[PDB]
Each structure stands twice: as structure tokens, then as C-alpha cells.
Write a protein that binds this ligand. Structure first.
Ligand SMILES: CCCCCCCCCCCCCCCCCC(=O)OC[C@H](COP(=O)([O-])OCC(O)COP(=O)([O-])OC[C@@H](COC(=O)CCCCCCCCCCCCCCCCC)OC(=O)CCCCCCCCCCCCCCCCC)OC(=O)CCCCCCCCCCCCCCCCC
Ligand SMILES: CCCCCCCCCCCCCCCCCC(=O)OC[C@H](COP(=O)([O-])OCC(O)COP(=O)([O-])OC[C@@H](COC(=O)CCCCCCCCCCCCCCCCC)OC(=O)CCCCCCCCCCCCCCCCC)OC(=O)CCCCCCCCCCCCCCCCC
Ligand SMILES: CCCCCCCCCCCCCCCCCC(=O)OC[C@H](COP(=O)([O-])OCC(O)COP(=O)([O-])OC[C@@H](COC(=O)CCCCCCCCCCCCCCCCC)OC(=O)CCCCCCCCCCCCCCCCC)OC(=O)CCCCCCCCCCCCCCCCC
Ligand SMILES: CCCCCCCCCCCCCCCCCC(=O)OC[C@H](COP(=O)([O-])OCC(O)COP(=O)([O-])OC[C@@H](COC(=O)CCCCCCCCCCCCCCCCC)OC(=O)CCCCCCCCCCCCCCCCC)OC(=O)CCCCCCCCCCCCCCCCC
Lengths: 135, 231, 29, 124, 365, 70
């Protein structure tokens, strides 16, 4: 009885007044899924639970209703591109912060730079040899 | 434990849990004689007798390889009926099946008899294997009884009868020796007995979380090179 | 979390030991 | 001015939020500090410093803000034979002396009254 | 008297898992309006033992929140039901919160209690502000030595028959069968004599519990199933350095695996400096362990509990603006921009504080 | 904000009126166009280059003081 008593209670299930004005996630998480994380199966359970609350665990309403994408991820590639152009050093710095916490040795860092700059130096010579072939 | 939470799990376009007449566009429609010139149909009223003759053949053709084992003929009969009583006891409304469940099941049983006529049905080979494993164990008991030796099964029956006397000889306040107490006495003997045997590891994990397989040998390394055969 | 580390150390986060023994074999059966 | 209810705490401690699914994945690394302003907050360096000269110097500064405190300061810095303003009490010698020298002074008060009452008239 | 108020009732065996009511002790706070805290004690362990921790002036936890020391089903005074499904046991708390008119609460637990607290946040996250787990982890503990002893002791307790056994026969049974001093003391105090001294029995359902543990399957209390899901809110874990229940080597990964917002060691996961002692599980007994738990507990309640995910601390409420996802609002003529997320009152549903303040706001204008 | 941005505002004062007062609050594509090209203070208007000089200037100058103070 107490279970149904609270389900029917309007106060127990009532959106706040500003709830309409708030930003609302219009997806249950089935649009972009994490496939290789160790909590993969735990993620699916929360998607399944969210889909059930929307339909009172009568998923026939979901099968009949409209399915929508995650319109919040729209134009996300363009937006990150403009942020990289605005401040590339800041975009690169923060996107690589957690990776740079583990810093390799001076030797490895030097090998990276040396082989990278050496590859660029040979690329420049091949560009010059092409101007020699054009002449 | 875990229950299906979706309330519409058994819903179909034809109704709840309908596996006899699924909804399809080309639905059955009636025919009128005065307007029907000709018709091509395979339905008939011969399924009842084909259901009877099919039972007699499957029974008589499987008994060819029982070697007069009366206990096997009776056990096989009980299993054969369980295969023919499926439409009589199923949740599926076999009388409301799309195009006649009677013809459907009969034709399905005929495919089974075809294999039985060749002695290639998996239930046949399963029966021979199961029976041979049983007779080998009954002959091992017979050979031990003829030698006056006691069987492993009698040692428990005798060891359990005395354990009951010891328990009821001290249970004087009460006098209701329930079947539950009798049961947990035997299980305590079976676990102890089974553990005594050198059996292959069945459970994934032993007392520790580690797996009980031959592959669950981790560090530290303490085993030397393998040694060769001795002369 | 969705940020567990590098690809090379991914098979490290799987083991869960029932004892306090160190070092711990990484492989999860 | 308005003070509200003494019992109630600030609304920040009472106002709460809850999570839901989906969740943002991003884990905050640092606190935002766009503007470098930390005014009206005292330094946390002043944490476990032992008693020193700043204690009696700041005491006088605050005592001199009151009428009764100004009397204590002037009397202490002038009429107390101490080699330091860092007063540390480890014995009650100076305290008992001042009590026995005071509570004793009020002796003979009753015997004095008896003189007057008894010298008034002779019983006989 | 006043600060200590524990509702009184009799356990009722229930055939339906939804008609289960929870009972426990309530500790009133110093201040008038404070959010509520729901704390689950160790399995088969008394709620009273945690009273001195939450009622110590040195810690002063009640200054922050009102505390509900609640017993799960089949434990203490709460109703009895053979199922221990964390989803069912979590709904029990939601009905308790409804009957007591609690919109959302802070959840805590010790050992297996920590699991129960986290399950509620996993099944009901919109109504849980935070979780504070003490010497527990969302993990399968069926094969942990500490759990086996508890699992073993509960099985031994099924052999005693109070009807025939005398009071002395019991004391001798516990000392020999129960080696751990604390578990022994906990079980002794759990024995109670019903009205009219008809007979003595355990306050907890010994039969239903042993089946859960002895079966040693997914529904076992030592086990943490994938069905429980993920907790989306604030979570802080505190456990002893040398703990039989949570091993620092690998038993910290489940926290990241189950709690999405857990940052890691030093931020949401701490270990208490201590020696190897099987009694360290009971932090409230040792001042050194308790003093650290209380400080960390008061810090979680004051600055981290009930704070939006993308905000660092409670200090950022009202001064840090979160980015908004495009096409997330119904209004079409909306210029998308950063916003400070809404943090509501702890019991805004069962009061009219918003309706009242709206009127006061109009009087200003 | 800087003086150069304030000069734009004085020059764009009439343009700000047309787009913000009239267009920005209209419905339809005319409103979406005005709210998109709304005139005011810059969102993410910081200049990383100017900020980069300030950082490298301060870091290299502290090196000068050590190298020169001998
Ligand atoms: C009678 C004669 C007629 C003559 C005229 C004939 C013309 C016919 C016109 C009819 C055709 C249009 C039909 C209407 C479409 C309506 C559909 C709709 O509702 O919108 C869907 C679509 C959905 O986008 P969204 O939902 O908002 O979000 C996108 C996602 O988030 C995704 O965004 P993201 O951030 O996640 O990143 C992924 C994104 C971007 O990913 C990328 O990385 C691709 C980037 C491509 C551009 C850059 C190329 C690289 C080279 C340049 C480098 C630039 C960067 C350099 C940076 C600096 C370097 C230092 O992927 C996309 O490509 C998005 C494209 C939109 C989806 C459409 C399906 C595309 C699949 C095919 C892909 C290959 C085609 C690519 C075309 C370019 C698309 C932008 O919106 C549109 O784009 C609508 C476009 C319609 C515009 C019509 C305008 C008027 C047209 C007439 C004008 C006159 C033309 C005259 C021509 C004369 C002859 C030549
Ligand atoms: C993929 C692998 C291969 C990669 C190959 C290399 C890729 C390209 C490399 C290009 C590098 C050039 C660097 C230029 C100087 C940057 C210096 C600086 O401090 O940066 C901040 C600097 C911003 O400082 P700011 O000047 O103070 O502007 C802030 C204002 O608030 C801005 O006011 P606002 O917020 O109102 O504006 C909106 C904002 C956002 O809006 C957008 O930017 C999106 C649309 C922009 C149009 C698409 C750009 C197309 C290319 C530009 C035109 C051709 C080149 C022009 C010359 C650029 C070189 C200076 O616009 C901006 O972000 C700044 C304006 C963008 C430039 C647009 C005008 C271009 C014409 C320049 C005229 C003046 C120079 C005279 C002509 C010079 C030639 C003789 O960024 C830029 O200005 C542009 C940087 C472009 C970098 C793109 C690629 C970077 C990442 C490459 C990764 C390489 C791989 C290795 C990574 C390893 C990781 C593990
Ligand atoms: C527009 C032009 C387009 C063309 C060019 C395109 C170029 C694209 C390259 C883009 C970047 C590549 C992807 C990097 C992902 C981001 C960084 C990252 O990996 O996350 C960190 C993560 C682990 O690093 P960590 O988390 O910092 O932990 C390290 C500890 O903190 C401290 O260290 P520890 O104690 O744990 O161990 C010692 C140390 C070991 O010391 C090292 O780090 C080894 C590196 C020494 C220097 C190697 C020379 C520099 C290479 C770049 C210059 C190329 C030269 C010219 C090439 C000419 C021929 C094309 O470990 C490390 O620190 C990291 C080593 C893990 C391997 C790093 C990734 C491979 C090297 C970079 C690939 C370069 C490819 C460029 C060309 C590709 C053309 C197809 O690395 C991983 O992703 C794990 C992946 C598994 C790696 C092991 C197995 C790899 C087997 C394949 C090897 C492929 C070799 C390719 C040779 C290229 C041709 C000769
Ligand atoms: C009074 C007693 C002496 C006091 C001396 C005073 C010392 C003052 C120290 C001042 C410290 C300066 C702090 C600022 C710099 C910090 C930033 C930094 O880069 O440090 C590395 C820093 C730390 O790296 P780490 O992983 O922690 O390893 C630390 C050690 O390497 C340890 O690594 P480990 O534990 O694995 O040990 C293994 C070790 C094993 O090494 C060995 O066992 C033996 C080494 C034998 C060397 C044999 C050489 C044979 C040469 C043959 C060549 C023949 C060709 C000649 C051509 C002639 C032509 C005719 O191998 C290495 O570590 C290689 C390290 C490379 C060292 C290069 C310098 C070697 C000689 C320096 C002599 C200085 C006088 C010392 C006298 C002491 C005598 C007892 O790396 C970073 O993470 C920062 C970013 C680095 C990015 C890479 C690019 C950096 C380059 C620019 C740096 C700034 C400007 C230049 C500064 C000088 C750099 C060399």
C-alpha cells in the first residue's frame, strides 16, 4: 500500500518549478556508448533503467514512440576545431594533462624530439631536391 | 534473485504470449463454393491416424536395439509419450495454430522416425550410451556382492543408519526427527565423501578467489626445468 | 570513470584480489 | 540590522543537489581562479605558532581600545616587577600572597564590634 | 530523551517485499533545519554502538546534519523478508524517506552497510546527495577471509536451540564457536527475550541470513552484482591502512568501476594510518581511527556532499558557471551559454519554502 | 575589454541598435540571425598571443636577473 501510496502522491513525483527551464538530457545513453571500459555492463543497466522509468516499465510505449539521436553532440567536431584555432597551446595542454602526468625519462623525450626534427629535416631536403628536379 | 522488469515482454501484435497465430498481412480468409472454380490445398484429415501409426513405428523400431531390456522398454515408453503429449499440455493453443497444428506436429514427428529407421537419432545414441554406463556400474556391484564384499553404497546406508541412532538417542526433549534433519546428515556425509575422492575441479573458484585450474600458477617462480623419464 | 589510462596498461585495472599479497599477478581469469 | 535566526545556518549548507544518469565524464583537476583576490581572509600560516611577543603587543593594542583595558596596561607596564611581558603562570605563589594579605586584613572586624557592643553597658 | 529518539516497534514477517518498513534510531541536530543523514550499521551489529561517534562534541557531526541510524530488513527492529536484493532493500529506504517526509538524504554505511548505502544511490540517485562508505567497497567479498568468518559464525549460530538450551549453554557455545571478541559481543547483545519471557531469540533473522551467506551466490551479501549499476553522485571512501575487508592493492579499483565521479586516492579515497589488527574494522572504538573518519566525514558533509559534479567544492556554488549542451532546452529563442546549476533545499518537496520566499521577493519589488 | 573594443562600440552604436533592439527579439530566422550576431562584450575574447608574450616576458626576465646579478 505504501508503495502505491507514494507513487500516486503528486509531491513525491513532481518536477520543480524551474525544471522546464533547465537543460534536459534528451537521450538515455544509447547514442554514444562506452564499449571497452570495465563498467561497460554497468552502463547498459542504467540505460535500461532510464528507458523503463519513462514507460512505467512498459517498453511497448518505447517501441511505438519516436526514437531520437543525441542532438547535444551536434557540431561537436567543428566546435573543438575552433577552440584549437583560438588557443592551440591551451587546447593541447589540457587535453594532454592527464597523459603528461607520467613523464618519460630525459633520454626518451630527447629521442622523440631528435627523431621528429630529423624527419622534418629530411622532408625539407626532399622538397629542395624536387626544386632541383624541376630546374 | 532477478526478475524481468519489462511488463510488455510477452506482448505480440497478435496478443499476449501468442506463439500459435502470429500476425501477418496474408491472413487466412474463407472460401465460398458457389464462387470457387478450383483450388490447390494440401490439408487433409489423415493426421489422426498418422499420429497413431507414427507412435507405433517409433516404438517398435527403437525396441530393435534394446536387446529385450524390459526396464529400458518401459523407460523409453515414458520418454516417447513425453514427446507426443507436447501438443496436449503446452501453453500454446495447438488447436488455434495458423494452418493446422495437427498436420504440423505429425510431419515433424515423421522426420524423427526417418532418423529412427536408420538408427541415427540422437536420442537413440544417447540411450545406448546412458544404458551402457548404467549396466557397467550395476555389474561392478554384482561382482562385489558375489565376492561377499560390501558396496560403497551399502557402507553409507549402514554408516547413516547408525548416525541416526546417535542423534535420536540424544534427542529426548523432542521426538520429531524431521526429514530436514535426516537430509542434512546425509549431505554432511556426501560432501565429506565426495571431497575424499580425487575428482577433477568442477567449481571455478576454490576456498580462495583463485581459480582451481592448472593454469592458475602465478608468481613467485619456484619450479625448475622439467625432468625426463627415469631408466 | 572513462579515463583509465594508456592502452598498454589497460589490462592492469581488471584484477581484484581477495588477499593482501604484493606484488599481485595482473592477469584476470 | 537584520540578523535572521540564530539557529538556522547559512542557506548554502542547507541547499543540496543530486546526481542522475547520464553523468558528465569530465573529472575536475583544479579549482578555477580567474581573478586573484583573497581579501578579508587571514593567512593560514598563523596556525601553530607558540606564544611570543606579538601576543602581549597585540593585547595592549586591543586593551587600549577600552577604558578598563587602558588601566590594566598602564599598571602592568609600570607596577609589575617582571623581566618580560610574556606572562606565564606556573605557580600560585603571587596569587596566595595577595589573598592572605587581603582576607586577613578584614580580621578583628567582629571583635571590634564586640568592643562597642560590650563596652556600651555593664551587665552586673 | 530529546537528542536521542528511536521509534519503537515490533518486527513483522512480510510475504511481499514492498510491504517492508524500516526502523532505527534518530539523532536530532543542534540547529533547526538541517539535511538528513541515513547511516547503515554493520550486518548483525547494533545501531547504539555508533551513537557515541555521532554524539561526540569533539567531532560535532550533528552540527551539520540530522542522523537516521536505520536498520536494514531482517536486521534489528526492521521488518523481515527472506530476499536481500539491494534493489528491494533500496526501495525500503525510499518508502521510509516518504513516510518520514524526506526528499533527499545523505547515505552512509560501515562494511556491508556501505554497500547498502551505495545501492540506494545506484537505484535512486536523484534523491541521494552523497555517499560516505567506511571500510567497504562495491566488491565481491565472498572469498575474503573476514567475510568467511562472519559467514562461518552465522552458520554456527544456527545450531543453538533457545528452547532447550540454557543461558549457560549459550555463553559456552559463543566463546568456543566465536573467537573474535567483537563479533561475540555483538551477537550476545543481539539476543533478546520477548515479552512474558516466553523464550530468547536473536534480533536478526538467523535463518534468512544464513541461507543468503551459506548459498554464497550472487544474492549473497558478500557479492556485489553488476545489476546494481553505477552511482552518479558524490562518494567518499575511508578504510584502515591494514584492513581485511578492503585491500589497498586492488580493492580500490571497484570504486572507480562503480562510482563515476570518484576522482581517486587522496581526493575521494583515503586510508587511515594504523597497525595490523583485526579489530580495526570497528573504527568507532579506537580514537585514532575515529578522529580521522570524523574529520573526513565532516569535510564531505560540509564541502563535497550534495555538490554538483562539475563543481569542485561547495565554495564554487554561485560563482562557477557550467557549459551548456546545444539544443538541450525547449525554448527555441534561447542563447546557449554557461550557467550555474540549481541546488535545491534538502526537503523542498514537503515544505513550502519556495512558495514563501517567492512572496517575500514580490514585497521587495 | 580594451580601448580598441570600446572604439568599435561607439562606431557600431547604430548597428547595435538595429540588431539588438529590433532583430534580436523578433521571431523566426530574423531573430536567430540577430541573436547570433548580437553586439556586446566578447565571449572568449581573450587574446592568447598577448597572454603568451606576458608569460614568456616574465619567465625570461627572471632569468635575466639571475644571469646579470653576479
Ligand atoms: C535547379 C538547380 C539546383 C542548383 C542547386 C543544387 C543544390 C541542391 C541543394 C539541396 C541539398 C541540400 C538539402 C537540404 C539539406 C537539409 C538537411 C538538414 O536538415 O540539415 C542536415 C545537416 C545536419 O547538421 P547538424 O545536425 O546541424 O550537425 C551536424 C553533426 O553534428 C555533425 O557535425 P560534427 O561536429 O559532429 O562533425 C562531423 C561533420 C563534419 O565532419 C567533417 O570533418 C567534414 C568537414 C567537411 C568540411 C571541410 C572539408 C575539408 C576541406 C576544407 C577545410 C576546412 C577546415 C580547415 C580548417 C583550417 C585549416 C588550417 O560531418 C558532416 O559532414 C556534417 C554534414 C551534415 C550531414 C549531412 C550528411 C553528410 C554525409 C556526407 C559527408 C560528405 C560530405 C561533406 C559535406 C560537407 C559537410 C559540412 O545540416 C546541414 O548541414 C544542412 C546543409 C544544407 C544547407 C543548404 C544551404 C542552401 C543551399 C543552396 C545554396 C546555393 C548552392 C549553390 C550550389 C551551386 C552548384 C555547386
Ligand atoms: C594535422 C597535422 C598537420 C598540421 C599542419 C599544421 C597546421 C597549421 C599550422 C598553423 C600554425 C600557424 C600559427 C599561427 C600563429 C598562432 C600563434 C598563437 O599564439 O596561437 C594563438 C592564435 C590566436 O591568437 P590571437 O591572434 O591573439 O587571436 C585571438 C583573438 O581573440 C581572435 O579573435 P576572435 O576570437 O574574435 O576570432 C575567432 C577565432 C576562431 O575562429 C577561427 O579561427 C575559425 C575560422 C578561422 C579560419 C580558418 C583558418 C584558415 C587558415 C588561416 C589563413 C591561412 C594562413 C594565415 C596565416 C596563419 C599563420 C599566422 O579566430 C581565431 O582563433 C584567430 C584568427 C584565426 C586566423 C584567421 C585569419 C587568417 C588570416 C591571417 C591574417 C593575418 C596574417 C597575415 C597573412 C600571413 C600570411 C603571409 O591562434 C591563431 O591565430 C591561429 C592559429 C592556427 C593554428 C591551427 C593549428 C594549430 C595546431 C597544429 C597542430 C600541429 C601538430 C603538432 C601538435 C602536437 C600535439 C601532440
Ligand atoms: C602530417 C604528417 C603525417 C605523417 C606523420 C604522422 C605521425 C603520427 C604520430 C602521432 C603520435 C603517435 C600516437 C601517440 C599517441 C599519444 C601518445 C601515447 O601513445 O600515449 C602514451 C602511451 C604510454 O605512454 P605513457 O602513458 O606516458 O607511459 C610512459 C611512462 O610515463 C614513462 O615511460 P615508461 O617507463 O612507461 O616506458 C618507456 C617509454 C618508451 O620510450 C618511448 O616512448 C618510445 C619512443 C622513443 C622515440 C621513438 C622515435 C620518435 C617517433 C616519432 C618520430 C618518427 C621518426 C620518423 C619516422 C620515419 C618513418 C615513418 O614509454 C613511453 O614513454 C611511451 C612509449 C609507448 C609508445 C609511444 C607511441 C609510439 C611512438 C610514437 C609513434 C611515432 C609514429 C610517427 C610516424 C608514424 C608513421 C606511420 O602510449 C600508448 O599509447 C601505448 C600504446 C602501446 C605502445 C607500445 C607498442 C607500440 C608498437 C607500435 C610502435 C609504432 C612505432 C612507430 C614508428 C614510426 C616509424 C619509425
Ligand atoms: C659536486 C658534484 C657534482 C655537482 C654537479 C652539479 C649538478 C647540478 C645539477 C643542475 C640540474 C639542472 C636543472 C635544470 C635542468 C632540468 C631539466 C632537464 O632537462 O633535466 C632532465 C629532466 C629529468 O630527467 P629524468 O628522467 O628525471 O632523469 C634524470 C637523470 O638523467 C637521471 O636518470 P637515471 O636515474 O636513469 O640515471 C641514468 C644515467 C646513467 O648515467 C651513467 O651511469 C654514467 C653516464 C656516463 C656518460 C658518458 C658520456 C660519454 C660521452 C661520449 C660522447 C663523445 C662525443 C664527444 C664529441 C667530441 C667531438 C670531438 O643516465 C642518464 O640519466 C642520462 C641523463 C643525461 C645526462 C646528460 C649529462 C651528462 C653529464 C653531465 C655532467 C655534469 C657534471 C657532473 C659531474 C659529476 C661527476 C660525478 O628531464 C625532464 O623531464 C625535463 C624536461 C626535459 C626535456 C628534454 C630536453 C631537455 C634539454 C634542455 C634542458 C635545459 C637546458 C640544458 C640543461 C642541461 C641538460 C643536460
Amino acid at each position: 500500500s505504501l508503495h502505491e501510496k507514494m507513487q500516486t502522491d503528486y509531491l513525491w513525483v513532481k518536477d520543480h518549478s524551474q525544471a522546464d527551464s533547465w537543460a534536459k538530457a534528451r537521450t538515455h545513453g544509447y547514442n554514444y556508448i562506452a564499449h571497452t571500459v570495465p563498467n561497460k555492463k554497468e552502463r547498459y543497466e542504467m540505460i535500461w533503467r532510464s528507458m523503463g522509468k519513462s514507460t512505467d516499465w512498459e517498453l511497448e510505449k518505447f517501441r511505438l514512440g519516436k526514437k531520437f539521436p543525441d542532438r547535444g553532440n551536434k557540431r561537436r567536431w567543428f566546435k573543438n576545431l575552433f577552440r584549437l584555432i583560438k588557443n592551440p597551446m591551451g587546447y593541447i595542454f589540457w587535453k594532454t594533462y592527464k597523459a603528461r602526468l607520467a613523464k618519460p625519462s630525459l633520454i626518451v623525450t630527447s629521442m622523440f624530439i631528435g627523431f621528429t626534427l630529423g624527419f622534418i629535416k629530411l622532408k625539407a631536403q626532399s622538397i629542395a631536391y624536387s626544386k632541383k628536379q624541376y630546374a | 534473485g532477478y526478475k524481468i522488469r519489462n511488463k510488455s515482454i510477452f506482448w505480440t501484435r497478435a496478443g499476449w504470449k501468442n506463439n500459435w497465430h502470429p500476425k501477418n498481412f496474408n491472413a487466412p480468409r474463407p472460401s465460398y463454393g458457389e464462387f470457387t472454380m478450383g483450388i490447390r490445398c494440401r490439408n487433409d484429415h489423415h493426421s489422426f491416424l498418422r499420429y497413431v501409426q507414427t507412435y507405433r513405428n517409433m516404438s517398435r523400431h527403437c525396441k530393435q536395439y534394446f536387446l529385450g531390456d524390459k526396464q529400458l522398454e518401459e523407460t523409453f515408453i515414458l520418454g516417447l509419450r513425453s514427446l507426443f503429449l507436447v501438443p496436449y499440455d503446452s501453453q500454446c493453443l495447438t488447436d488455434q495454430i495458423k494452418h493446422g497444428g495437427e498436420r504440423r506436429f505429425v510431419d515433424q514427428l515423421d522426420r524423427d522416425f526417418e532418423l529412427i529407421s536408420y538408427n541415427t537419432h540422437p536420442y537413440q545414441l544417447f540411450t545406448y550410451t546412458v544404458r551402457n554406463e548404467h549396466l557397467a556400474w550395476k555389474n561392478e556391484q554384482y561382482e562385489k556382492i558375489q565376492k561377499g564384499e560390501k558396496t560403497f553404497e551399502q557402507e553409507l546406508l549402514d554408516y547413516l543408519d547408525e548416525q541416526v541412532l546417535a542423534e535420536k538417542a540424544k534427542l529426548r526433549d523432542g521426538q520429531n526427527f524431521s526429514i530436514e534433519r535426516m537430509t542434512e546428515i546425509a549431505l554432511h556425509v556426501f560432501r565429506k565423501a565426495r571431497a575424499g575422492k580425487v575428482r577433477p575441479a568442477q567449481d571455478v573458484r576454490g576456498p580462495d578467489g583463485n581459480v582451481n585450474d592448472f593454469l592458475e600458477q602465478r608468481r613467485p617462480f619456484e619450479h625448475p626445468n622439467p625432468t625426463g623419464v627415469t631408466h | 570513470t572513462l579515463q583509465w589510462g594508456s592502452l598498454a596498461e589497460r589490462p592492469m585495472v581488471d584484477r581484484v584480489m581477495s588477499t593482501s599479497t604484493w606484488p599481485v599477478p595482473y592477469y584476470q581469469r | 540590522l537584520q540578523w535572521g535566526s540564530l539557529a538556522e545556518r547559512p542557506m548554502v549548507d542547507r541547499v543540496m543537489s543530486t546526481s542522475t544518469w547520464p553523468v558528465p565524464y569530465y573529472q575536475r583537476l583544479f579549482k578555477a581562479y580567474p581573478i586573484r583576490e583573497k581579501k578579508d581572509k587571514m593567512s593560514l600560516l598563523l596556525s601553530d605558532i607558540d606564544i611570543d611577543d606579538t601576543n602581549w603587543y597585540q593585547a595592549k593594542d586591543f586593551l587600549r581600545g577600552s577604558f578598563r583595558g587602558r588601566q590594566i596596561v598602564d599598571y602592568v607596564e609600570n607596577n609589575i616587577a617582571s623581566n618580560t611581558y610574556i606572562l606565564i603562570q606556573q605557580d600560585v605563589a603571587n596569587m596566595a600572597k595577595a589573598y592572605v594579605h587581603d582576607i586577613c586584613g578584614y580580621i578583628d572586624v567582629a571583635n571590634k564590634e564586640n568592643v562597642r557592643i560590650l563596652s556600651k553597658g555593664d551587665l552586673i | 530523551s530529546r537528542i536521542i529518539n528511536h521509534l519503537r516497534g515490533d518486527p513483522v514477517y512480510q510475504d511481499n517485499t514492498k510491504d517492508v518498513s524500516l526502523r532505527g534510531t534518530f539523532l536530532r541536530g543542534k540547529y533547526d533545519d538541517l539535511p538528513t543523514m541515513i547511516f547503515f550499521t554493520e550486518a548483525c551489529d547494533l545501531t547504539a554502538n555508533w551513537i557515541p561517534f555521532f554524539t561526540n562534541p569533539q567531532y560535532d557531526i550533528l552540527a551539520h546534519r540530522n542522523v537516521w541510524l536505520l536498520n536494514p530488513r531482517n536486521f534489528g527492529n526492521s521488518d523481515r523478508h527472506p530476499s536481500f536484493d539491494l534493489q528491494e532493500m533500496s526501495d525500503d529506504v525510499m518508502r521510509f524517506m516518504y513516510s518520514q517526509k524526506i526528499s533527499m538524504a545523505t547515505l552512509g554505511g560501515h562494511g556491508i552497510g556501505g554497500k547498502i548505502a551505495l545501492a540506494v544511490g545506484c537505484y535512486h540517485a536523484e534523491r541521494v546527495t552523497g555517499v560516505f562508505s567506511i571500510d567497504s567497497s562495491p566488491m565481491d567479498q565472498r572469498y575474503h577471509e573476514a567475510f568467511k568468518e562472519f559467514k562461518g559464525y552465522v552458520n554456527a549460530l544456527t545450531e543453538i536451540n533457545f528452547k532447550t538450551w540454557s543461558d549457560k549453554d549459550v555463553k559456552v557455545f559463543l566463546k568456543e564457536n566465536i573467537k573474535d571478541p567483537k563479533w561475540r559481543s555483538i551477537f550476545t547483545n543481539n539476543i533478546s527475550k520477548n515479552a512474558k519471557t516466553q523464550s530468547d531469540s536473536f534480533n536478526f533473522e538467523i535463518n534468512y541470513l544464513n541461507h543468503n551467506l551459506n548459498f554464497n551466490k550472487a544474492d549473497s551479501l558478500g557479492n556485489w552484482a553488476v545489476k546494481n549499476g553505477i552511482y552518479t553522485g558524490r562518494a567518499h571512501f575511508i578504510f584502515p591502512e591494514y584492513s581485511r575487508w578492503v585491500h589497498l592493492a586492488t580493492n580500490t579499483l571497484p570504486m572507480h568501476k562503480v562510482c563515476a565521479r570518484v576522482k581517486g586516492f587522496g581526493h575521494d579515497i583515503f586510508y587511515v594510518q594504523g597497525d595490523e589488527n583485526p579489530l580495526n574494522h570497528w573504527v568507532y572504538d579506537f580514537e585514532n581511527y575515529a578522529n580521522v573518519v570524523a574529520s573526513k566525514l565532516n569535510k564531505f558533509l560540509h564541502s563535497y556532499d550534495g555538490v554538483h559534479a562539475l563543481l569542485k567544492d561547495r565554495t564554487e556554488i554561485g560563482n562557477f558557471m557550467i557549459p551548456d549542451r546545444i539544443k538541450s532546452r525547449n525554448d527555441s529563442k534561447h542563447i546557449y551559454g554557461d550557467y550555474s546549476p540549481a541546488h535545491l533545499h534538502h526537503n523542498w518537496r514537503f515544505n513550502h519554502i519556495y512558495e514563501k520566499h517567492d512572496e517575500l521577493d514580490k514585497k521587495l519589488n | 575589454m580594451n580601448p580598441i573594443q570600446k572604439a568599435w562600440l561607439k562606431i557600431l552604436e547604430p548597428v547595435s541598435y538595429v540588431i539588438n533592439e529590433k532583430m534580436a527579439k523578433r521571431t523566426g530566422i530574423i531573430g536567430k540571425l540577430g541573436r547570433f550576431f548580437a553586439i556586446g562584450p566578447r565571449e572568449y575574447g581573450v587574446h592568447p598571443i598577448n597572454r603568451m608574450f606576458i608569460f614568456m616576458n616574465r619567465k625570461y626576465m627572471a632569468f635575466q636577473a639571475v644571469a646579470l646579478h653576479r
